[PDB]
């Protein structure tokens, strides 16, 4: 009744197709329990969002570096951006860790206690700060009212999962082609279209 990850196979019992981006691919039986599934879905959503932001940033700075700007490549970016900076390391590390502790702790307690942070505790915010779904918050993180329609919200959730999976699969590819060619991803893309027959993953010495 739905397209599966392996045409002809049978999906598991705990994967009916009601989840966002469900395809029936789970061979190691992970997320079989309801609580484990509740944790795994949020882990996938947070990984998809962080992967989409990181891949977009890497492509942006790489395209800007190929255009002519003073942007370093995605790899070794933190090395040459810290030598000429007034923000000290350690202090910057713990500043980032301190802000992320507050945000991630509120998000974690929202998962264990669904709809709990929106009780006027954090500076008096009752309507917002309470999630609508599992890993889909609302109220403040939805400026445009695009979540108040299930017919479009379901399709938009599907688009988010299918784009995040491709983005994280692309991020894994960023490390591999960098470690195999020592060049920028936009430099590897432009070099592949310049010679699609000669240059490829098999004519670069490494990975043979």
């Amino acid at each position: 009744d739905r397209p599966l990850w392996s045409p002809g196979s049978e999906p598991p019992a705990w994967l009916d197709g009601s989840l966002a981006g469900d395809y029936g691919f789970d061979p190691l039986h992970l997320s079989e329990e309801p609580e484990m599934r509740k944790w795994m879905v949020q882990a996938e959503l947070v990984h998809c969002r962080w992967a989409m932001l990181g891949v977009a940033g890497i492509l942006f700075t790489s395209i800007g570096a190929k255009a002519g700007g003073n942007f370093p490549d995605w790899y070794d970016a933190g090395k040459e951006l810290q030598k000429n900076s007034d923000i000290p390391l350690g202090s910057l590390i713990f500043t980032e860790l301190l802000l992320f502790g507050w945000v991630e702790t509120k998000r974690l307690y929202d998962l264990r206690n669904p709809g709990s942070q929106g009780d006027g505790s954090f500076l008096g915010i009752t309507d917002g700060l309470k999630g609508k779904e599992n890993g889909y918050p609302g109220g403040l993180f939805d400026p445009m009212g695009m979540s108040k329609n299930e017919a479009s919200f379901k399709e938009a959730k599907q688009k988010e999962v299918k784009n995040g999976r491709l983005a994280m699969l692309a991020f894994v590819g960023f490390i591999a082609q960098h470690h195999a060619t020592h060049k920028s991803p936009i430099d590897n893309l432009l070099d592949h279209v310049a010679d699609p027959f000669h240059v490829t993953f098999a004519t670069n010495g490494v990975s043979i």
Binding site: H29, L30, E32, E33, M36
Partner: protein, 41 residues
């Protein structure tokens, strides 16, 4: 999955969780901090 996580609570939880944790903790302490014969007071 419930049977695998309940299998992981018999002998690994006591012989490979604690043993690996305690051994790794003492070893990393003796690796980053070299040989300690006093309270360095």
């Amino acid at each position: 999955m419930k049977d695998f996580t309940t299998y992981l609570s018999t002998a690994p939880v006591v012989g490979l969780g604690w043993a690996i944790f305690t051994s790794g903790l003492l070893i990393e302490i003796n690796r980053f901090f070299p040989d300690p014969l006093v309270f360095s007071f």
